[PDB]
Structures are given as C-alpha cells and as structure tokens.
Design an enzyme around this catalytic site. Structure first.
Site: not given
Ligand code: P9R
Ligand code: P9R
Lengths: 303, 303
Positions: B43, B144, B146
């Site tokens: 991503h 950040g 990931c």
């Molecule tokens: C690394 O970039 C990041 C790590 C996250 C950010 C804060 N703590 C973490 O562990 N990863 C992401 O942002 C990925 C990106 C996507 C393209 C996969 N997505 C997330 O981790 O988004 C955060 C998730 C929890 C919120 C969404 C939420 C889930 C339940 C339904 C309502 C929305």
C-alpha cells in the site's frame, strides 16, 4: 480491546557493539567498551571461594594489567586498571571505533530503561524494566549475566544507567550505576541482605489510568478529586510512592480532559478493590508503564 | 517474589542494518533490505484517496522502476519491481553488505517473535508478541510504522516472519508473512473486516503454570488430572486453544515432576476462578509466555 501498550525497549544495536567478555581466570562476565575504557563488575576478581566475604581492595592490589583478559565476539590489551566503587575501570590500547555518543546517569524509581542481557560478551536478549522504589528491578538474569547493561536514549545519545551485579532472595535484581554505587542500600557481596519493601509507583499508575481513558475505558473516573497533598499523606500509610507531576503527565491530563486529582481519587478507590471490573483487561493496578511510555506509544509524542 | 520472566526480545542489531525508507510519493513507510532485494508493504503505492478500495494490480502496472525511492539512514536505485501477495519485491543495484544469514518462515498461533518498530526507516523500538489464535498481535504501532518487521532467531540465523500492515478496530494488529499472505483472513484494505474471536493459548498457560512451580508457587497443583483429549474437548466450548505437547513442555514436566495433565486439570479449575489467590502475582491466566521463554529465562535452556 487492546491498549496499544507493550514493554517497549530501545533498539540495542549501538550497545551491542560495546559489549566484551572480561575474565580474571575464575569468574567470567561482560564488560562495556567505550573509547579506551572497559567497565565491568568488580567481582570478576573474586575467587569463587570468596564471593561471600571478599576484600576488593586486597584483590585489586593483587591484580596487574595482564590479570584481565578482554575479548569481543578481538583481544584488547589492558594497559590500566582501577576500581570505582563496585566497578572496575580498565584501560585498553584500542578505542571502540563504534563508540556511541553516550552519558552516564543515575535512574530514579519509577523511571524505565532498556537492558541488554549478555553472556560471555555475546548479547542474547533485550527487555525494559522500571526501577522499583526499593531500588531493585524485576528482570531476567542468570549466572554469567553480570555486566549486562541498562540504558535510556535521548536522541542519538545513550544514557547508561545500570550495570548488573546480583540477584536477591526474592528473585528481583539490582546493580550499580556507572559512578560506582549500587542502587539502594545493597552491597556486591553474596550474603543475606535486608531488602526494603517495594511500593506502587503512584505516577506510573496514573499514566496507566490515563492510558485506559485514551482507549475508551473510564468507568473509574468520578468527578470526585483528591489533592496531591491528601494523596501523598494517604500514600505513606498504604505502600504507595508520593506523587510528583510532570509535563508528561500534564500533557496526558490535557488530551483526556481528566484531572490528575480525579485519578488520585480513583487510585484510592481502586486500591480497595476493582469491584469485579477490568481496566485494560486487568483487575490490579499497573505501575510498569511510565507517562512517557503512554505519550510515546499511544499519542506518538516523544519528549 | 519475582518469576524472573520478562518479555524478552532478541537483540535487534542485525535487523536494524536491514531497514530502509521506501516511498512512492504519497505514503511513506519502511522496507527490509536483504541482498539485492527490498521488501515493503504494497500500500506504499496507494494514494491516500484510495486506501479503502485500491486495485493493486492497476497501481503496480502504473508503477515503473523509478517510481520507488529507497533510502537508508544512502540512496538505492531500483532496477526491478514485482508484487507478491500483499508485499512488493523491489530489486536494487546494491546488495546490503550487512545482510544476515536469514530465512523466511510463517509463525503459528501461540509462538512468540521479536518486532522492530521503525519509522521513516529509522528503528525506534523493539518488543515481543505472541501470534494470537485469531492471527492478530497486541502490538504498539502508529502511522508510518508499516514495514516494521517481526523475526525469530535460531542460532546466528534470522527467521523473518512478519511485515506489519494495519491495525484493526479493537486496537490489535496484523500483517503479512514474507510469502505475501496476511495472517488470518485479513486483507490489506482500509475497510471494516470481520475479526475472529481470540482464545487463551492452552500451551502458553501451561508454560506459565510451570513457571509458577519453578518459583515455589504450586497451590493449584492437585493430584487430579485431565487427559489432553478431555481438555481439548473442554477447550472448544470454552474459548481455549487445543493443547499440543512438545519437548519444551516435556522438559518442563521433567524438571518440576508435575504432569501436564495435572495442569490441564488446574486450568479448568482456575478458569472458573482463582478463589482470591494469586499466581505469580496475577489473578488471571497468563498466555503470553511460551514454554521456550520459560525454559530459556528460568532454566537457562535454549533449544
Ligand atoms: C502503516 O502505514 C499503518 C499502520 C496503522 C496506522 C496506526 N496504527 C497502525 O497499526 N497502516 C495502515 O494505515 C493501513 C493502510 C491500508 C491500505 C491497509 N490501514 C490501517 O491500518 O488503517 C487503520 C485501520 C483501523 C482503521 C480502520 C477502521 C477498521 C474498522 C472499521 C472502521 C475503520
Ligand atoms: C552475575 O555473575 C551474577 C548474576 C546472578 C546469578 C543468577 N542470577 C543473577 O542475577 N551475580 C552474582 O552471582 C553475584 C556475585 C557476588 C560476588 C555479588 N551474587 C549473586 O547474585 O548471587 C546470587 C544471590 C541470590 C543469592 C544469595 C542468597 C541471598 C539471600 C540470602 C541467602 C543467599
């Protein structure tokens, strides 16, 4: 639900490059190599037939420069040896080319730091502890771990704060700061030593209670309040430390809109019992997370 | 009394040398540099206006070699880019001269591994987690993070097992193995995903109960016994994993002279309630310590 709080250690790479094996011929343990200096516990001089009533003054004078063998996993030649409290200050002909920017500092009860547990000079594991009120730590050390170090990080600077020395009757541990002293009233002799009573770290319990609010848990927050003065007076008859606020706690009161005193009141209530409820999946007060840990891991704010 | 058990992470130095910053222009995160390869979450290609319904096949084809910028804190030129599941496999003109001896392996529920949390390619902290039965972890990640990696060590060999991807609604975390798959049924898309129920890791609770005996705590050990079969049947209606013995648990039954089945019986009793008593200073069952952790930290036996 998960708090997002884990026992976070600093990365250990910079310290790993500073670990050596030191031996006098009897005992073997670990030393810290920085510049032209190698620090290690002084009972490396002790014969195993005298760990209980050793005279380090006499043992030191019985030592010469080539009584010490320093190895990295090269061989460092010792050119000067001195004793400072419960530590030896050996001088080697080669400066650690990987020496970090470092300082020596004493850690205070409640505060956390990262430990690099080593054996035969080979780093084997890292963890993080909080200095207990009775100047011990609840670590994980075995034989040959002495000299394993403990350190905090401020920017690119390593603040060394702990060189491991011994274990106590109750399973906890303690060691010396790099000025030579042991923490608490302990002495690096293998005999029975009186241990002081430990206490809950009031500040770290508040940090934890704040951490619970930042996760949606706040059933304990009642509008009632307890002043710091009244809390500290209460803390002395209840085996709690006395509370001292900081900018790190203040930042946690700003984010949540919950006053420190509301939580002091909450600690008095919870100490008598959680009434069957859970806080962050726990039914006992947690004091192994600092305000800095909470600010960092949950709010992303290092200071 | 203290158990001598802490959350022990492997030392992180070898992995720190393998972390880089990778960016496509929108998102920035971390990558793992080994030989002429850099692994990172896919991503990184996503625009922030499409993290919820991205088409990675289309995004990848829209990428060329110079769409990726890899930095260490040098600059690595990308000469090949490919996608494997939820990870990108970038090829750089320079091999990591500090590449460790490594393998890629999948971690299974209950087992532990060490995580190196990084940001902008700069390692900031290390911890250790257990893979939960529902294929999440109770970590500490922010934006950040990931690409932060997770790894076990067997000798001088790093077994990489986890590249961080996302956080779930309940605060826990999950990511991908280095074959490309996410653990559990998760998908690296920022939408609501059904989460499975977590469970107590039966084997890790037995390891803990053994750890308590090795510290003089054994009020729970009654001569009664429960067979593995009867325990597993019980575990399915009670949100416990099914128990599978190992040489590491067998070694713990030999040292204490306490049968595994006696403790299976004990878990059934304790699950209904500790009756106000404490085990290792706890009133709830602990399942975040493996038999290996207990063998290592307490008995000094790595295997
Ligand atoms: C690394 O970039 C990041 C790590 C996250 C950010 C804060 N703590 C973490 O562990 N990863 C992401 O942002 C990925 C990106 C996507 C393209 C996969 N997505 C997330 O981790 O988004 C955060 C998730 C929890 C919120 C969404 C939420 C889930 C339940 C339904 C309502 C929305
Ligand atoms: C490092 O060499 C080693 C670290 C110990 C060993 C196992 N776990 C540890 O943390 N340090 C020592 O052995 C020092 C050496 C002395 C010269 C200071 N001493 C100890 O730590 O000895 C073990 C202590 C607990 C047992 C003595 C016990 C104390 C209560 C009264 C009865 C005897």
């Amino acid at each position: 639900h998960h708090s997002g709080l884990v026992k976070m250690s600093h990365p250990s790479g910079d310290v790993e490059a500073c670990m050596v094996q030191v031996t006098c011929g009897s005992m073997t343990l670990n030393g810290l190599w920085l510049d032209n200096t190698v620090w290690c516990p002084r009972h490396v001089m002790c014969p195993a037939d005298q760990l209980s009533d050793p005279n380090y003054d006499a043992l030191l004078i019985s030592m010469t420069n080539h009584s010490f063998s320093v190895q990295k996993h090269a061989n460092l030649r010792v050119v000067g040896h001195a004793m400072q409290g419960t530590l030896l200050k050996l001088t080697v002909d080669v400066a650690n080319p990987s020496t970090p920017a470092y300082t020596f500092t004493t850690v205070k009860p409640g505060a956390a730091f990262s430990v690099l547990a080593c054996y035969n000079g080979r780093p084997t594991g890292t963890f993080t502890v909080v200095m207990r009120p009775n100047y011990t730590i609840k670590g994980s050390f075995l034989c040959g771990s002495c000299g394993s170090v403990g350190y905090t990080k401020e920017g690119s600077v390593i603040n060394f704060c702990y060189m491991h020395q011994m274990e106590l009757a109750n399973g906890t541990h303690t060691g010396s700061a790099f000025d030579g002293t042991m923490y608490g009233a302990f002495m690096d002799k293998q005999v029975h030593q009186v241990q002081l009573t430990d206490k809950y770290c009031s500040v770290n319990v508040v940090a934890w209670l704040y951490a619970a609010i930042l996760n949606g848990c706040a059933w304990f927050v009642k509008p009632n309040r307890t002043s710091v003065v009244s809390f500290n007076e209460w803390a002395l008859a209840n085996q709690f430390t006395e509370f001292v606020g900081t900018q790190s706690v203040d930042m946690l009161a700003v984010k949540t809109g919950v006053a420190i005193e509301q939580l002091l009141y909450a600690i008095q209530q919870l100490y008598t019992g959680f009434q069957g409820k859970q806080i962050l999946g726990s039914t006992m007060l947690e004091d192994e997370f600092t305000p800095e840990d909470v600010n960092m891991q949950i709010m992303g704010v290092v200071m």
